[PDB]
Every structure is written in C-alpha cells, then in structure tokens.
Design a protein around this ligand. Structure first.
Ligand code: HEM
Ligand code: CA
Length: 400
C-alpha cells in the first residue's frame, strides 16, 4: 500500500491491473520506498534522475554477498551460474567484452528478413473470425523462434524448445518452472558440443570461435550460461513488448490511425511503447556496498535496491505529458533498456522484433479489435515484469 494522501495498492490487489497511479503516487510523495516484500525488504526508486544515476552508481553492485557481513562473504561464491547480469567488474567486463565481439548489432539486424517470415507465417495461420489469444498464439511465439534463429537451434528441436520456453513465461512458476530450466540448460550444452563438430552461421557457433587480443575465450560453463541468459532476458521481455504495444494501439485509435497512414512511424512507436508501458517494470535486484542517498533518503549498506523503470519512464520531470501515448514523439533517454555497463545487450534485436511483430500484425489485420473488456484482462503477478497472460482478440479479414 501507499502512505500518501491517497493509498494505492502496491504489488497486490489493483496494482497488477494498473500500477501506474501507484507509481505516480510514489514519484510524488515517496520516491525511495522501503517495501516489506515477502522475501525481504527492498527499496524502490521511482524518480527518473534517481534511477538513471543508480544504474551507473559504483556503490550499487550485483553481488548479493554485500548483504552478508564482510568476513562471512570471503567464503561464499558470488553467483550460482556465471551469467554476466549477476556479476560486477572485472568479471562482468570480461564476459560482456567477449560476447560483444560475436553478438554484434550487425547480426541483430541481419535477422530482420527471417523475423518477418516468422510473423507472416504465424499471421497466415490465424483465423479471420476469432476470438484468439494473441499472447499464446502470436506474441509468445515470435521471441522464442527468433532466439532459435540467433542461436541456430535445429528446426526439429524448435517445437520442444518453445514448449519449455512457455513454462518460464506463463505457467506454474513454483517447482514446475525450474523443471524446464534444467531441461533448457541441458539441451543447450549438448547443442554446444554438437556445434563444435558441425559449425554454422549462427551465434552459438560464433561464440565458440571467439578469442581476443590476449587469447581469452569462453569456458564451457560460461558459454551455456550465456546461451541460457540470452533466452531468459530475450523471451519474456520481448513477448510483453509485443503484448503491451499491441494493447497500447488498440486502446488509442487516434494513434493507431496515425501509424496506419504513416507505417514508417513504427520505429518511433516501439520506442514509446517501451516508455509508455515498460515491459520490464522493475530492474533486477541491486545491492548497497555503502550508504547511498537518493532524494533525501539514505539506504544503509547491505540493502536490496530495485529500480522502478516503469515509474521512471512516466516521470514528468524527464518527459512532458508522460501519461499521454504519442508514437510521433522524439524521446531520448528512456530507462527501459537500462543504463551503463548492464545496458540491454539485445536492445536492437528487441526493437526489431517489436517493429516487425506489431507493424506487420496491424498491416495484415486492419480490423483487429479486443474481443474482451479492458478490465477482463489478467496480468501476470510478477515483480520485475509488466505483461498479459492472455489477450483475446478478434483478428478480422486479411488485407491483400
Ligand atoms: C524486449 C524488450 C527488452 C527490455 C525492456 C529489456 C530490458 C533489459 C534491462 C533493463 C536490462 C538491464 C538489467 C539491469 O541493469 O539490471 C537488460 C539486460 C540484458 N538484456 Fe534485455 N530487455 C529486452 C529484450 C532483450 C532481448 C531481445 C535480449 C536478447 C539478447 C536481451 C538480452 C539481455 C542481456 C544479455 C542483458 C544483460 C546485460 C548485461 O548484464 O551486460 N534483452 N535487459
Ligand atoms: Ca530431439
């Protein structure tokens, strides 16, 4: 709950339907908020400038060991599995540097024609007369197929791969979500050992070959962790980019008709969807190495911090009229992909998938409409994520 003039629900009740008035309430009246979450307390930065500068704040680290007393941490491993997103320099830098050599913005762009055939394929298999769940049938699909094309997952293994991927996004997130984790992990290892014998154009083959101006390469353990990471960070988030962006246009006809007339605005549109309804609403947990101070509030060392990306993006100090959806905007400096050394590695691929999935969906089905009321929509009860479990839509006649 909120503590200001008017008390909004936080991470319960109405929050999950629409967290934005609660974010507006926090930015205004309680910008650095200690939340009594079930697991442990966590501080929430909602103001733009706070979040923006917290990302590049050295006193904020990804090492969870900062919560344990100084002597007790000289014993514990830093991370369970070597994913760079869990690491600080110089350990993160070494992995980021290597991945970046092969996972280039160029490869990200060269998938564009391939992505289109996935969307068009999926669109071609959707009935003129709905109702159809646009999430499970379309938005759930594009990000996982694209990731296969990037990694080079054999066409045979792709049904099995997407099957396990759905568990992570929308399923029984308890023990059943972790069952698919070990299955996807195992498959990718065996895949890497197959890629060693038979190489290809794909990124997994590319990553195996990457040395540097020191002869440093990715170890087996690091390779498969990276493969697993690209999947987790690149699936659910991009799904919800699609989910949220489609929903944004459906609820704003004025803007849907702007895009209809000028389909080149899609690139500008996807930018403002990431702002207007940030799919990753909360940044992965950070830790205080020492007393930081934001908007008057001093977070003591050893505390868990959370950066309100969704909140910081609708901040009026940064963005004029921050609650109005304008796809023609010239936005610059949103915190939806993050900031600093942890900036979204697949930022450009995400944008591509976004523009293709959304742009082609509307061009192919100009009569698209929600097949249920706005309030009937169920949103996932996830802390980090802002997105739908189901989105019933009526497709309409295909345009030829
Ligand atoms: C679809 C919209 C997406 C959003 C809103 C998003 C958001 C983010 C954010 C905020 C971070 C920084 C996390 C932090 O600093 O704690 C991040 C990191 C990352 N993302 Fe994305 N992401 C998206 C799509 C993707 C895609 C498609 C990929 C595929 C490669 C991807 C891969 C990664 C990776 C590998 C990192 C770790 C960066 C590092 O630690 O150096 N993301 N993402
Ligand atoms: Ca098989």
């Amino acid at each position: 709950t909120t503590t200001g003039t008017e008390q909004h629900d936080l991470f319960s009740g109405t929050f999950w339907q629409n967290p934005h008035p609660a974010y507006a309430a926090l930015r205004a009246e309680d910008p650095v908020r200690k939340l009594a979450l079930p697991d442990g307390p966590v501080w929430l930065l909602t103001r733009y400038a706070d979040v923006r500068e917290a990302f590049v704040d050295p006193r904020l680290s990804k090492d969870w060991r900062h919560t344990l007393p100084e002597d007790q941490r000289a014993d514990m491993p830093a991370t369970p599995t070597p994913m760079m997103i869990l690491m600080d320099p110089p350990d993160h830098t070494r992995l980021r540097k290597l991945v970046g050599r092969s996972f280039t913005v160029r490869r990200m762009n060269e998938l564009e024609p391939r992505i289109t055939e996935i969307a068009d394929g999926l669109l071609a298999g959707l009935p003129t007369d709905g109702p159809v769940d646009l999430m499970r049938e379309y938005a759930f699909q594009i990000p996982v197929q694209v990731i296969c094309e990037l990694l080079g997952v054999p066409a045979e293994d792709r049904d099995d791969f997407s099957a396990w991927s759905s568990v992570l996004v929308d399923d029984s997130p308890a023990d059943d979500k972790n069952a698919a984790m070990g299955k996807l992990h195992g498959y990718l290892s065996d895949l890497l050992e197959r890629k060693r014998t038979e190489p290809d154009d794909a990124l997994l083959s590319s990553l195996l070959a990457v040395s540097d101006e020191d002869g440093d390469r990715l170890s087996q353990e690091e390779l498969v962790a990276m493969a697993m990471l690209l999947l987790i960070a690149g699936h659910e988030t991009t799904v919800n980019l699609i989910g949220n962006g489609v929903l944004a246009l459906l609820t704003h006809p004025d803007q849907r008709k702007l895009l209809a007339e000028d389909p080149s605005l899609i690139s500008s549109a996807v930018e403002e969807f990431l702002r207007f309804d940030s799919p990753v609403s909360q940044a992965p947990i950070r830790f205080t190495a020492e007393d930081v101070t934001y908007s008057g509030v001093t977070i003591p060392a050893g505390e868990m911090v959370m950066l309100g990306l969704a909140a910081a993006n609708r901040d009026a100090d940064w963005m004029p009229e921050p609650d109005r959806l304008d796809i023609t905007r010239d936005a610059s400096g949103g915190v939806f992909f993050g900031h600093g050394i942890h900036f979204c590695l697949g930022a450009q691929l995400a944008r591509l998938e976004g523009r293709v999935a959304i742009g082609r969906l509307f061009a192919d089905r100009p009569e698209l409409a929600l097949a249920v009321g706005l309030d009937e929509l169920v949103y996932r009860e996830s802390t980090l994520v802002r997105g739908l479990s189901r989105m019933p839509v009526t497709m309409g006649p295909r345009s030829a």
